[PDB]
Amino acid sequence: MELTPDQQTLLHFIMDSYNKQRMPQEITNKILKEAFSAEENFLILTEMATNHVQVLVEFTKKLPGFQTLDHEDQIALLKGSAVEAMFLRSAEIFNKKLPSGHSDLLEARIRNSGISDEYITPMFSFYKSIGELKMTQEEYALLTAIVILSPDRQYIKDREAVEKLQEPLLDVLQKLCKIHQPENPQHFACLLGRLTELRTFNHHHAEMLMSWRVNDHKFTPLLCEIWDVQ
């Protein structure tokens, strides 16, 4: 029921690595500060997304056993998880508590980002669903690690090698759900359920970005490698 000494060690190691990310307040303060044009918001996104991929590669490299995996499978895992990890981090940021009225302004600022309305509706639906689960910092960290170490990614040669690495993280998360939310025994299942909804952002990600109301869709060389753009 309770975490074993090895599980407490793994949890703290994942947490320390996860906290190397850009602070949510840094992101929300920028968006809440001024009302930006669609052109300025596109550049804010590319810079934010480039920082996120850089930090995500560093977090991924620290996941126990990742460096022992096949080099081609390592690339496949990173490319397969980058977009999902970005939406999971955006959901964490969106659900962080702000002074009264600020989360309403943040929502409105995201609606006026420059992208098509058809892509906005599913994002908020996912963020509000993530928010109702009242996830702790440890739950977001483990869920990101679980997303990265998904053995069911396309172009994976050794699925069992990936499964062996994801298994101890799923075990720790299951114990945390039972401890943090004993009132809701469906909590772990709900978290695994959100992981299946996260995957919907993959297929139409390039279409969403190219729908931005800008003259030139300039992406960084790193974003071109991880996204299906340029």
Binding site: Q54, V57, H71, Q74, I75, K79, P221, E225, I226
Partner: peptide
């Protein structure tokens, strides 16, 4: 193809 990702991983 994924030269930058391979570089960041192998660094």
């Amino acid at each position: 193809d994924h030269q930058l990702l391979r570089y960041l991983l192998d660094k």
